[PDB]
Amino acid sequence: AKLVCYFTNWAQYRQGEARFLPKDLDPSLCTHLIYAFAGMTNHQLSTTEWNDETLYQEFNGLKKMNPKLKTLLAIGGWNFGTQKFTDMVATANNRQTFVNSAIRFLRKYSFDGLDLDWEYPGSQGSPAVDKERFTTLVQDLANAFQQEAQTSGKERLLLSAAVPAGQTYVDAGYEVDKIAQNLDFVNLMAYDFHGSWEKVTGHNSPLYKRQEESGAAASLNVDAAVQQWLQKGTPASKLILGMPTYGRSFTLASSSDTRVGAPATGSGTPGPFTKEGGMLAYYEVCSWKGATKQRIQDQKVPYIFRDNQWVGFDDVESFKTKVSYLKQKGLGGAMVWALDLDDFAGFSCNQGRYPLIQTLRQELSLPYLP
Ligand SMILES: C[C@H](NC(=O)c1cc2c(=O)[n+]3ccccc3[nH]c2[n+](Cc2ccccc2)c1N)c1ccccc1
């Protein structure tokens, strides 16, 4: 089984005990660490933070402590948008420029592979032609990684992709059966199912549908998303189930209606550390004074509220339920967004360091590597 964990290169700017920096990485917590994010300049892979080269050295230096750890660099992300991806895949020459730059870049900084986080081909402004061009880009990278392994005699660079769970995004940009053959593994973003872009409360990452749901809404859950990618042609062993160590927050229309599906007026108040309206880290909801925790019986996940603030999140119990689920399905493992949103320092939840990700590790019965 795999435990794929995302590091974010902006967590270093959080204040106080929420600041995430080199020393906070555990070299044996996960099997694969993915560095978010790289960017693109003139169709070539490039850094996005002033000290990325310093962090790369720290990041990939973990492999000196755990030689079996694999590291990947993720390009893209939500805020990156789509225009640079669209321009790069528009021509064979631009794709070749990108592919060659990626191989040199990964080898130079000692990454073991590349994680494609284009969000998304065919959506977020990207034209419909990008669906097939994304298939071609995945093929170009896979084939070029294979060729580089042969000419260099080194171990082949890995290729993964972070993929959406909602059907409108999948059908707009993903030839699932084709790309699954060329990807080493598929990181299913089984979160952001609901959020403050909607006018009623809903859970970030529900495992199952609610009984009252219908239509397209009844597919906005983990089980439906997994079945979607499996039925569309992803081998179970390549499908890695994403897990959130954060929640999605709402400002309720009235403190007297705290139901799942209650009217919301907008995003929840920004957290004291993450400072991003609409989301909260696990350590910002696990010891929230005065709040009331609840569980969604149909969906097997908690929510919590205080006054006009409503947050759906994941706890140790829901992570355990989700792992038991993935095991029943025969999936390749779990993926986590993100290291810095768990209680990585153990300063808030009184559950030790990395309580959520240690739960995944234990439930997946991953080997204790020295
Ligand atoms: C990776 C993850 N997710 C986003 O980065 C993100 C994902 C969506 C989204 O799926 N999504 C789906 C459907 C419709 C809109 C929408 N918008 C999104 N916004 C923008 C956004 C807008 C309004 C309120 C909150 C967030 C986002 N930043 C994340 C990153 C950092 C910290 C926690 C979690």
UniProtKB/Swiss-Prot annotation:
Location (main, coarse): secreted
Tissue: Detected in spleen. Secreted by cultured macrophages.
EC number: 3.2.1.14
Keywords: Carbohydrate metabolism, Chitin degradation, Chitin-binding, Disulfide bond, Glycoprotein, Glycosidase, Hydrolase, Lysosome, Polysaccharide degradation, Secreted, Signal
One GO BP annotation of this record: response to bacterium
GO molecular function list: chitin binding; chitinase activity; endochitinase activity; hydrolase activity, hydrolyzing O-glycosyl compounds
Keyword Ribosomal protein set for record: no
Catalytic residues identified in the record: 119
Consequence of changing residue 53 to K: Rare variant detected in patients with Gaucher disease type 1
Residues glycosylated per entry: 79
Catalysed reactions, as listed in the record: Random endo-hydrolysis of N-acetyl-beta-D-glucosaminide (1->4)-beta-linkages in chitin and chitodextrins
Other comment: Very high plasma levels of CHIT1 are found in patients with Gaucher disease type 1 (GD I). Can be used as diagnostic aid and to evaluate the success of treatment that brings levels back to normal.
Entry protein name: Chitotriosidase-1
Organism of origin: Homo sapiens
Upper lineage: Eukaryota, Metazoa, Chordata, Craniata, Vertebrata
Residues of the full protein shown: 22 to 391 of 466
